[PDB]
Amino acid sequence: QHGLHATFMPKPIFGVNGSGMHTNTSLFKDGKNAFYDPDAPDQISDTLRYFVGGVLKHIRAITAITNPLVNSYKRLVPGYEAPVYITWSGPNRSSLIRVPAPRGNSTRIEIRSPDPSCNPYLAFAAILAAGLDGVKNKIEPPERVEKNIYKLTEEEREKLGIGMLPGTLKEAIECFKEDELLVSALGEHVSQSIINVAMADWDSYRTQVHQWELDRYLQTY
Amino acid sequence: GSKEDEIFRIVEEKNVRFVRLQFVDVQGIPKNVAIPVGQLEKALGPGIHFDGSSIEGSDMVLRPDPDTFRVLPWTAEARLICDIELPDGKPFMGCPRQVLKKNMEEAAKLGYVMNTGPEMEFFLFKRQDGMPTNIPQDRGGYFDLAPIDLAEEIKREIVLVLEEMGFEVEAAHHEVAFGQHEIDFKYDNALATADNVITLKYVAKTLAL
């Protein structure tokens, strides 16, 4: 109407910040906040750590749903607001999952990896299925990384067992293919449709000759 | 003198009609007085008078150095690097060439002689509407070869013109930045090298135009 164009693309411009969809998530069991425990340290319930543990276990596979475009992986690069390393921590340090200060009925986690181009119906279903699995199977999450990861060295990150999110759409789709929990939660029909559309885009994108290649090689070679 | 007789031989042989009495201001910018060949005897003898306010950035004499007589390879024209003296005959201590000569003479008293071999870097830019720009003529890199280095003919002409003026170059090559080049000079005394540096800048800018 105003002669403009609004876009929810993850990374429309190179060199600037990309658009993200940070999902503030809270689980309620029996009307009360299941993420709250007044007797536990910091006032965080066991259900919160098992939910976080479950999401982090399948986060590589969830990335195919929450970051579904080829362009989504141009947003998952260091130097910007977007998380790239698979860590969870407190509010002071921005990581993939961040547990803010508010307590009581406002106890929550914030999953920062998704982008606004994802299907919200499928993104929340994938987070619910992975989070509930960790609670059911009582999956303990890794240690909280309060130090910045960007300043840490590559060899140091390898010693701490810190992982990385998928670098390409094909890489996330390969991880999603093997995740039996998410394929069953989303159904064989939706899971196959996601794979088919993503690989059709990936096979078209990989064969293309982009302008960067002409700028880098045409004059010299 | 005989050096003077040598000059007049080259004048008749190459048909020199104009001579440039070159000199340099405190900032290193080349300045000159163009005189017809008829006044060359007057220049090599009592000298040509001019205004010394230009050297700063009001009356002095141009004293040509006979060893610096060179025919410009582009009727023919010739050049002569000049030292500045005051009307009475004393050397003008504001002349940069006379300053280097003094410092070299002091070093010579202690038996010391300094040899310099500079590595001259420069850029070759395009021209837009008769005015110079900072747009590289070529998109070349470090030690690149043609057609990546487009300025190979101009550099070839620069070194050829220098050799035709009693000047020997060690090597020339394309530098790191786009349109940047370097000409490495051979070793020589501080005075000859400084004369050579001024000549290179003049030749490179003339052939670029």
Ligand SMILES: [Mg+2]
């Ligand atoms: Mg946020």
